[PDB]
Each structure stands twice: as structure tokens, then as C-alpha cells.
Amino acid sequence: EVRTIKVFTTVDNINLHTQVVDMSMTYGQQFGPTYLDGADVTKIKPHNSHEGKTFYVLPNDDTLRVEAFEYYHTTDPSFLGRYMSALNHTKKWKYPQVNGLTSIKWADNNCYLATALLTLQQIELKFNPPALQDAYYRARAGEAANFCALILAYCNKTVGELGDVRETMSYLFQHANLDSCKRVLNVVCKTCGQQQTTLKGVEAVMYMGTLSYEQFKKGVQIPCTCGKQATKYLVQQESPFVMMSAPPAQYELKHGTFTCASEYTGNYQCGHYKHITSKETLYCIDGALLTKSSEYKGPITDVFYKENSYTTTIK
Ligand SMILES: OCCc1ccc(O)cc1
Ligand SMILES: [Cl-]
Ligand SMILES: [Cl-]
Ligand SMILES: [Cl-]
Ligand SMILES: [Zn+2]
């Protein structure tokens, strides 16, 4: 006797595709790799409780390929498996509200994710893939499991792997609309003269070398091809925020002079991130943990600043 149930397959969990499955064969034999809200059911035969449920599958026909790319903006064939594998874990994480922001209770080396998530909620940024748009809206409201799983998938990080905040923000910014952002820099060598540069998009909002937005406006010293030390300063800026990054070092954060910052303790390959936000006082959010202080000194790696338009007076 043949028994069947109706299920739906999906790539985006919005558009559903009716399927009738034979209860005597695995999902894998009928769809290929198949997932139920993160759980890999490829090797499992259908259960009666599965009737009417949605399963994620790979894009094995052109309708699914178009749906998958429209929703995720990626054609990496291993994306689904990485997203499903991460979601199995992030579904179990806790997402407390800390000082009005969605954070992440510490688990599985996820401090860099918590810091990035708290930072996103403090800067003006809209994502381009609907998958991130939708999941970020849910994360803002406190249901951040899908957003965190997607970040891990897009960044090619597995749960438990320690990531870098700057690298993660770089990935997230590539999937955001930063097209209006523009940066003009001037590099002044005493041997080689001037050289001005224009940066756009992600490169117009990120800098590596110094944490101070003010010193960037005054000038920082960098190598030259001739062997001398040349001075680089900010000519013009057009963006809603700027990110200043540098190798971790002792740095003093003063209330009211920045938006938020990433603190990193440890070494290159093993450590812990905390988040400092400047509100009515300085709050340090460490996953679910919250402390406050009037002044801050610590190993800072990233600082975020508000911006709209800046023009130098250094002519
Ligand atoms: O475009 C590939 C990304 C993807 C494919 C299938 C899914 O079910 C989910 C995501
Ligand atoms: Cl968005
Ligand atoms: Cl990383
Ligand atoms: Cl600021
Ligand atoms: Zn030179």
C-alpha cells in the first residue's frame, strides 16, 4: 500500500511549491537535500506530522533558481547548507533586549556577531537582498535567529568560528545600499607632492589605520613608494556614518564624541569582543551583560561616527 502526504518546498519560505511525497522514500530520494526549519531531513522518510509543512530545497528548476537569486542575491551552491546548518544553532541562542537594542547572549564564540548586530541598530543602513531586509526587521524586533544564520552564511563562517567585526561589517556593507557614499582623500609627500583619491560605496565609509575621525581630518602618516612618510587626510565625506578601524590598542572613548565602538581583548586567533555605545552615558554591552561608566579606556578596534557631509578647510 502506498501512502503519501502533501508538503511544500521552498527556497525563500514565501513562495511555496506543492509536492506529494511517498512516505516509503526519504526526502533525499525525492527532492535532494531537504531541510525543515534548519534540520537536515535528507535521510529521513516523511512523517504524518509533516503534512502541510514547508521544506527548504536546492534550486533544482529554473523557477526555484530565479526565486533563490531574487531573495538571497547569491548563486553559491553551498549557501543553503551553510544557512540551514547555522540556523539549527542560532534558533537556540537567546536575544535579550539590552538598553533597547537586540543583543545576543554569549554562545559559540558569537561575540563578534553580537557587536555587529548592536552596531547595525545604531547606524543608517538598508540591505539589498530581501532575505536580509526581512530577517533584519525581525531581528530589530527581537527574533534575530534567521538574521544571525544568514550573516554566518553570507560571511562563510560556521557557528563556533571566531570572526572579525571589521570583516563582518565589510560583508554586510557589500549587501547594503551605499551607492550615495563618497570619500575624497589627499596624500601629500614632500618628495612626490600631492595625490588625491576618490572612494565610493563600502570603501568610502571604512578606513583601516586609525580610530580617530578627527586625526583622519588632520592627517595620518603612511608609507610612500620613495621610502619617505607621506601625510593622508580627509578632503570630503558624504555618508550617514563612517567606520574607523585599527589593530587593537589602548584607546580612550569620550562620551558624546562617537556613536559606538568595538573592543577586542585577546590575540589574533582567540579573543572576545565587547560593544561600547555612547548614549546618556557610556554603556558597555557584552552579549547579555551591561555595565556603565563615565569614561572608557580599553583595546578598541572599531569606532563608528555619525556623518552627513564634511568638507575640509585644509586648502
Ligand atoms: O541561490 C542559492 C541560495 C539558496 C538556494 C536554495 C535555498 O533553499 C536557499 C538558498
Ligand atoms: Cl534593511
Ligand atoms: Cl571574519
Ligand atoms: Cl558621532
Ligand atoms: Zn614619496
Residue nearest to atom 6 of ligand 1 (CA): 58
Contacts of 278 (CB under 8 A, 6+ apart): 253, 255, 256, 257, 258, 259, 260
Q: Are strands 54-57 and 4-10 parallel, antiparallel or unpaired?
A: parallel
Contacts of 240 (CB under 8 A, 6+ apart): 123, 124, 125, 181, 306, 307, 308
Q: Which ligand is nearest to the CA of 229?
A: 5
117 in the same domain as 68: yes
* Backbone φ, ψ for residue 150 (5° rounding): -65, -45
Ligand 1 proximal residues by C-beta, below 6 Å: 11, 56-59, 68-69, 72, 74-75, 79-80
Report every protein residue that has its C-beta within 5 angstroms of ion ligand 3.
Answer: 163-164, 167
End-to-end CA distance of the chain: 86
- What single DSSP character describes residue 163? P
193 in the same domain as 172: no
69 in the same domain as 31: no
> Coil, strand or helix: which one is 82?
helix
Helix axes 145-155, 165-174, angle to 10 degrees: 90
Q: Are strands 34-36 and 17-22 parallel, antiparallel or unpaired?
A: unpaired
75 in the same domain as 37: no
Q: Which ligand is nearest to the CA of 123?
A: 4
* Backbone φ, ψ for residue 259 (5° rounding): -90, -60
Instruction: Show the cell assigned to 315.
Output: 586648502
Contacts of 14 (CB under 8 A, 6+ apart): 71
Of 17, 33, 57, which closes a domain?
57
Q: Are strands 241-254 and 295-306 parallel, antiparallel or unpaired?
A: antiparallel
Residue nearest to atom 8 of ligand 1 (CA): 11
216 in the same domain as 165: no
The full DSSP string for 198-245 is EEETHHHHEEES-S-HHHHHH-EEEE-TTSSEEEEEEEEEESSEEEEE
Cβ contact 3:45 at 8 Å: no
In a 10 Å sphere around its CB, with 0-12 CB exposed, 13-18 middle and 19+ buried, how is residue 312 labelled?
middle
Report CA(52)–ligand 4 centroid distance (Å).
Answer: 50
Q: Which ligand is nearest to the CA of 152?
A: 3
Look-up: residue for cell 561608566?
293
254 in the same domain as 300: yes
Nearest atom within ligand 1 for CA of residue 76: 2
Resolution in A: 1.9
Alpha-helical runs (H) found in the chain:
27-31, 62-72, 79-90, 111-120, 130-140, 145-155, 165-174, 202-205, 213-218
Cβ contact 165:112 at 8 Å: yes
In the chain, the number of structural domains is 3
Report CA(94)–ligand 3 centroid distance (Å).
Answer: 22
> Coil, strand or helix: which one is 35?
strand
The CA-based angle 250-256-262, given to 5 degrees, is: 40
Instruction: Show the cell assigned to 195.
Output: 595625490
31 in the same domain as 62: no
For the chain, how big is the Rg over CA atoms in Å?
23
160 in the same domain as 53: no
Report CA(240)–ligand 2 centroid distance (Å).
Answer: 15
By residue count, the chain amounts to: 315
Domain of residue 128: give its range: 58-181
What positions carry a catalytic annotation? 111, 272, 286
196 in the same domain as 148: no
Q: Pick from 259, 239, 260, 236: which is nearest to 312 by CA?
A: 236
- CA gap 149, 247 in Å, rounded: 27
